[PDB]
Amino acid sequence: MFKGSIPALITPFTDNGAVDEQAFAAHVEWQIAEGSNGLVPVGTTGESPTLSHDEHKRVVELCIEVAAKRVPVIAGAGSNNTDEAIELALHAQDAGADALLVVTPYYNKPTQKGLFAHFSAVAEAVKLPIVIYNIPPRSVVDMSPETMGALVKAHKNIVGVKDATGKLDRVSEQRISCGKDFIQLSGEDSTALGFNAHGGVGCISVSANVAPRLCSEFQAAMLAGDYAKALEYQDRLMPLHRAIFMEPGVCGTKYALSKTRGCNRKVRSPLMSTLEPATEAAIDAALKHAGLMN
Amino acid sequence: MFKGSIPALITPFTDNGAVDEQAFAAHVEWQIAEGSNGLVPVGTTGESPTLSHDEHKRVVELCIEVAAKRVPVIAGAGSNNTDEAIELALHAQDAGADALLVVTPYYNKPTQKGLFAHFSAVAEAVKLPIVIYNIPPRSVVDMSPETMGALVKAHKNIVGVKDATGKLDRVSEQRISCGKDFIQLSGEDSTALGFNAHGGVGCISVSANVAPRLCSEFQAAMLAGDYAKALEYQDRLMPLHRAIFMEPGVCGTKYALSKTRGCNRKVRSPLMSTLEPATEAAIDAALKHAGLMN
Amino acid sequence: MFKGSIPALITPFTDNGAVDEQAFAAHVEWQIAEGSNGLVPVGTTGESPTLSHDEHKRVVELCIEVAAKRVPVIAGAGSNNTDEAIELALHAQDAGADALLVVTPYYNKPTQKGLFAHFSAVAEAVKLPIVIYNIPPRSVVDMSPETMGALVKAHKNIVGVKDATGKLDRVSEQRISCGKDFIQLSGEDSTALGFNAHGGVGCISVSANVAPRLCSEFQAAMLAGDYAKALEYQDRLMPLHRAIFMEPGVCGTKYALSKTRGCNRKVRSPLMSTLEPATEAAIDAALKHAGLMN
Amino acid sequence: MFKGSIPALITPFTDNGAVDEQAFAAHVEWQIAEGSNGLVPVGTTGESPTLSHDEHKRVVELCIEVAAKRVPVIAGAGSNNTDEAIELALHAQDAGADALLVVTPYYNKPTQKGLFAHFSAVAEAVKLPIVIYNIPPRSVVDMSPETMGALVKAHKNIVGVKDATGKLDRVSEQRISCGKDFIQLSGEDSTALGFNAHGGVGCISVSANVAPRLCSEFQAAMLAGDYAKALEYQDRLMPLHRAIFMEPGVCGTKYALSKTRGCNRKVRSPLMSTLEPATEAAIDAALKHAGLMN
Ligand SMILES: N[C@@H](CCCC[NH3+])C(=O)O
Ligand SMILES: N[C@@H](CCCC[NH3+])C(=O)O
Ligand SMILES: N[C@@H](CCCC[NH3+])C(=O)O
Ligand SMILES: N[C@@H](CCCC[NH3+])C(=O)O
């Protein structure tokens, strides 16, 4: 599949900061019931940076168990250390994941050849399909369409991109360098609309955590070529997309879910369990606009 | 009225550097015959910065004359000096322009309140509709959706935006702040596709100078809601969009037209009448890919 | 000379926006009396963008007349249009200027070869020494040390740079490409200290408009190699440097001068004659800290 | 205590990728013998991202052992996860470190309040002095002078900053918000000169790995107030500063040391053990210019 609305799942915690397994399972079940087309456990939105390797692996395991092969599980296996990425990738494969989401190394700022070496090493270590997570706003480095194309040519299991550049011309450039069959998924909720118009086939989504049905219907409209209907969904959802990201998306999302479903707001430091009053007011207004709150 | 494929017309020069009125008229005639839905004389692509006031005014006059009310003429009237913008706007109005394209002040970096004051002064001085030209990559400053919305509320003749931010979420934000009836036109050829998906109704276009029929058909497909067909045009045109802008777009465009139509490559310093061999090779390949050269 | 504290002079206006010749003359006389080492009429801070060519030329003329050859007059002759730069440069030369300040073309975004052609054309048109004004925060383009070095090699009258990159390693790179004898002047008040440590010999200064004596003494300390004393001046002046630029520097400066010397706050649109309360409070506090107000 | 030339030590590896304890010890001995005034084990340059926790802790231990209290050891204890930072900080304290270098969280992009919470939690967990490592080019987020000042007020053991903003006005702003006694150390080799002119008292240095004596003498000149001599060292060292960073600094440094001292170029993926020919040529030329190679 690798298409449609694919939530980058939050990782719920109890007040003491421990992983809340029952809350996570309930979230996954609800996501599937509401029409989410795939699942990304332990991406950015799943607070990958503040989980231990054991916790990361466990959340991936739990997601696979709960999904029960109903929709593809694209497991977060990203690291700025190639050894760690391989370790996480191998666990996810053994646990029964359907694909891997692998971020460009952050902080250490490798060259394009370093990016090639990193992704090549992961691709050679596993048999699973790999989705490249290109996110310059977080990793600073930016995998060029040329480097991406080289990886596609070299490795049959490098199958797609979660493109969080926010530059929609990159979709067009990636079509040229990687082919029309290369799976392009939006890494940004607010531009998922234009992204699919350029050739994208879905979105790995933060907002889908809050509004899985509306997000799935939005993606279904674009698959059907009904962009007029898709724009109606954008009118309905854009205030939420924006409000969730006024402060870190993880925190915006957990606040939104605390209002709609009574989810816990707890996150791990340096993320904060609190938000500014204006952010909360904007999220409240966006939820009302979307019809998720009265 | 203001929609579809709207070329930001080049201003052809003769070898002494003077405006070539014959070549300009022929270009306008050909643009209309090939399906262009409107005309922007003396925008960025028309080398507004290197024309005198007299020359600027004359090119606007000539465009109006040649158009003969067949398509709307949205006259370039931008300046970083409010006095000059008013002077150019008043001339264009007297000459018979249908609208004005007014850029955000460049170099002097005004505040949001300065932007408001600038556009308010222009709007109060004329009766014509005004399209705000928001281009942070050139002007550095960026008119916020809030400032844009305030201008829309304050002035009935502020009717649209040529949005060259390259941030397609801005279209969605401008829909919220300015309304669904606010006329949004892409200021970037390469993302015109996603731009319309977000609610845009056309593109003020550099590439239309070279491929007016293909660009018009591309825009027509999106107006009809046929985004699958629009993507086919993007496949055909993207190499050209990219190649024209490897070096300044004015120079890329004039090279392309020198190959297809024998147009003079002459531009005014600090723009160059020459390009790098790799740029010319890429433009050549793009023209062949688009079916404009054999 | 071309060294020490060189104010980029404000252009005072009367309430109706006309150039106030008597106020300008008084400002220049006071600057010289307080120890300013040179003068830049009609730079950015002189509101070059909103003066007509006639007004630009007149202010340059007046500055030359008032200075009476006591300190060098480095006349603003910048334009994004090579023809206009030459026109302004030739007038300044005829009027008796000692040098020219020539900005990198803004808005139209030329290539490095375009920058070379622009500065070469100006250099060949005049006999006067030229100071390149490299300001990427306004012009977007950035003259590389390689391009700068090429201009120095090609033209004996390209003698220096007003470097507003804010990247002090550029001073070191420019020493390599242009030589140790190349005159480097800071284009940023807040980093004039580190700039001279790297090999700079002065600053073309906004803050010198407000505190010419303190700025001259600051520069004199660095010339003497007394960087400990220079740091004491930085402690005294930094709050003013910062406060003046919270909003556009022209407006911050004119407010500061309205408080200390009763100068008119009038500027030309899109600059504003007003500031936010917090900006005015910060400038007030900075003036008190510097000892310019009680 | 914390001043002068402080190398951010490389971590040498053997060909199997393991930490080379013999080579690391020899490097530390040589650094101290050549005049380095302090040591930072397992910073960015020490490849902190690609070490395991056990390896990170071991390299810190070894550095402390070899130093034998001759110069202060400022142990790398940075993480984007507050729990990990605390774990690493507590180990370093128990091992006998003199201070901690703690980076702003990377990738997860916390708010200013998140930064405050992160550094507060680390400061409360240990008794050791903490140097904040502010590096927007890697972490994206940027600790403001206001947030830094708040941390200084709240915690007596937050004593300094490794400032890698490359904005030298920040030193002046940090003097205001944090006080004149706040220990400011340059996080950039190429602007260490201007940094100290603004009030810095040293540099945590990549280049010191290659040229420890020249870097120590450079810093000694600035401490003595001899900025003319310091500039002479900048003339000698600038080509090396630049060449080391054409590609990742770790790799530039290890190449330089392979030429001068026979050090292994081995790094951990996604860093590469190879460089472009032009980079190696530039490093070669820089070493010859500095008198480190014939
Ligand atoms: N905090 C580290 C380790 C996380 C390990 C589990 N995902 C990082 O962001 O890379
Ligand atoms: N070169 C000036 C004047 C151009 C006047 C005609 N458009 C500018 O770019 O603002
Ligand atoms: N406003 C135009 C013309 C100014 C002419 C006098 N300096 C510009 O900024 O280029
Ligand atoms: N690769 C992870 C863990 C490194 C742990 C040792 N410093 C990171 O960069 O945060």
Phi, psi values for residue D224, rounded to 5°: -80, -10
Q: What is the DSSP letter of A104?
A: P
Closest residue in chain A to residue D43, using alpha carbons only: A108
Residue B184 contacts A, CB cutoff 8 Å: no
Report how far apart, in Å, the C-alpha atoms of D96 and of each of D59, D65, D123, D280 are. 13, 9, 17, 38
Residue A138 contacts D, CB cutoff 8 Å: yes
Which of C198, C232, C241 has the most D C-beta neighbours within 10 Å, making it the best mutation to test the interface with D? C198
Instruction: Check D173 against C228: CB less than 8 A apart.
Output: no
Residue A270: cis peptide before it, omega within 30 degrees of 0: yes
Instruction: Check C107 against B106: CB less than 8 A apart.
Output: yes
Q: Which residues of B31-64 are buried (b: 16+ CB within 10 A; e: fewer)?
A: bbebbbbbbbbbbbbbbbbbbeeebbbbbbbbbb
Residue D270: cis peptide before it, omega within 30 degrees of 0: yes
Mutate to test the pocket of ligand 3, among C11, C47, C50, C59 (most ligand atoms within 8 A of CB): C50
Contact B284, B293 (CB under 8 A): yes
Residues of B in Cβ contact (< 8 Å) with C139: 107
**In 10 A of CB C181, how many CB atoms?**
9
Q: Is A80 in the pocket of ligand 4 (CB under 6 A)?
A: yes
Element (H, E) at A99: strand A99-103
In 3D space, the residue among B129, B131, B58 whose CA is nearest the CA of residue B98 turns out to be B129
A touches which chains (3+ CB pairs under 8 A)? Answer: B, D
In 3D space, the residue among C136, C129, C131, C164 whose CA is nearest the CA of residue C148 turns out to be C131
Mutate to test the pocket of ligand 4, among A44, A48, A79, A81 (most ligand atoms within 8 A of CB): A81
Q: Which residues of B238-249 are buried (b: 16+ CB within 10 A; e: fewer)?
A: bbbbbbbbbbbb
Which residue reads 């200013």 in tokens? D112
The CATH number for D1-294, chosen from 3.40.50.1220, 3.10.180.10, 3.20.20.70, 3.100.10.10, is: 3.20.20.70
Per-residue tokens: D109? 């992009």
Per-residue tokens: C164? 């507003």
Q: Is A84 in the pocket of ligand 4 (CB under 6 A)?
A: yes
Rounded-to-integer distance, Cα C195 and Cα C166, Å? 9
B100 beta partners: B75, B130
Q: Which residues of C88-127 are buried (b: 16+ CB within 10 A; e: fewer)?
A: bbbbbbebebbbbbbbbbbbbbbbebbbbbbbbbbbeebe
Distance from CA of B192 to the nearest CA of C (A): 22
Rounded-to-integer distance, Cα C126 and Cα C143, Å? 21
Contact D199, D177 (CB under 8 A): no
Contact C194, D197 (CB under 8 A): yes
Phi, psi values for residue D202, rounded to 5°: 165, -170
Q: Is C108 in the pocket of ligand 3 (CB under 6 A)?
A: no
A162 beta partners: A133, A185
Closest residue in chain A to residue D135, using alpha carbons only: A107
Residues C164/C168/C172/C175 CA torsion (nearest 10 deg): 20
Q: What is the DSSP letter of B226?
A: -
Rounded-to-integer distance, Cα C71 and Cα C63, Å? 11
Rounded-to-integer distance, Cα C261 and Cα A269, Å? 52
Residue D239 contacts C, CB cutoff 8 Å: yes
Name every residue whose Cβ is closer than 8 Å to that of residue B291 and which is 6 or more positions away in sequence: B236
C74 beta partners: C99
Which residue reads 């980076």 in tokens? D103
Residues of A in Cβ contact (< 8 Å) with B238: 169, 172-173, 175-176
Angle at A147 between CA A145 and CA A148, to 5 degrees: 60
Following DSSP, what letter does each residue of C120-150 receive, concatenated? HHHHHH--S-EEEEE-HHHHS----HHHHHH
Rounded-to-integer distance, Cα B137 and Cα B134, Å? 9
Longest Cα pair distance anywhere in chain C, in angstroms?
A: 52
Residues of A in Cβ contact (< 8 Å) with D110: 248, 270-272
Instruction: Check B197 against A199: CB less than 8 A apart.
Output: no
Rounded-to-integer distance, Cα D203 and Cα D192, Å? 6
Residue D223 contacts C, CB cutoff 8 Å: no
Instruction: Check C173 against D239: CB less than 8 A apart.
Output: no
Contact A248, D107 (CB under 8 A): no
Mutate to test the pocket of ligand 3, among B80, B86, B268 (most ligand atoms within 8 A of CB): B80
Element (H, E) at C227: helix C227-244
Which of B193, B206, B226, B242 has the most A C-beta neighbours within 10 Å, making it the best mutation to test the interface with A? B193
Contact B94, B83 (CB under 8 A): no
Phi, psi values for residue C39, rounded to 5°: -140, 135
Rounded-to-integer distance, Cα B210 and Cα B252, Å? 10
Rounded-to-integer distance, Cα D143 and Cα C184, Å? 31
The alpha carbon of D80 and the centre of ligand 1 are apart by a number of angstroms equal to 8
Which of B19, B50, B253 has the most C C-beta neighbours within 10 Å, making it the best mutation to test the interface with C? B50
Q: Strand pairing of B202-205 and A4-7?
A: unpaired
Residues of D in Cβ contact (< 8 Å) with A111: 247-248, 272
Amino acid at position B133, single letter? Y
C touches which chains (3+ CB pairs under 8 A)? Answer: B, D
Q: Is D80 in the pocket of ligand 4 (CB under 6 A)?
A: yes
Residues of B in Cβ contact (< 8 Å) with A189: none
Instruction: Check D248 against A108: CB less than 8 A apart.
Output: yes
Q: Which atom of ligand 4 has the smallest separation from the CA of D81?
A: 10
Residues of A in Cβ contact (< 8 Å) with B172: 190, 193, 234, 238
Q: Is A40 helix (H, G, I), strand (E, B) or coil?
A: strand
Q: Whose CA is nearest to atom 1 of ligand 4?
A: D49
Element (H, E) at D101: strand D99-103
What residues of D are labeled active site?
133, 162
Q: Whose CA is nearest to atom 3 of ligand 2?
A: B49
D19 beta partners: D13
Angle at A109 between CA A103 and CA A115, to 5 degrees: 55
Rounded-to-integer distance, Cα B168 and Cα B166, Å? 6
Per-residue tokens: C61? 């003329």
D touches which chains (3+ CB pairs under 8 A)? Answer: A, C
Rounded-to-integer distance, Cα A197 and Cα A199, Å? 5
Q: Which atom of ligand 3 has the smallest separation from the CA of C76?
A: 7
**In 10 A of CB D278, how many CB atoms?**
11
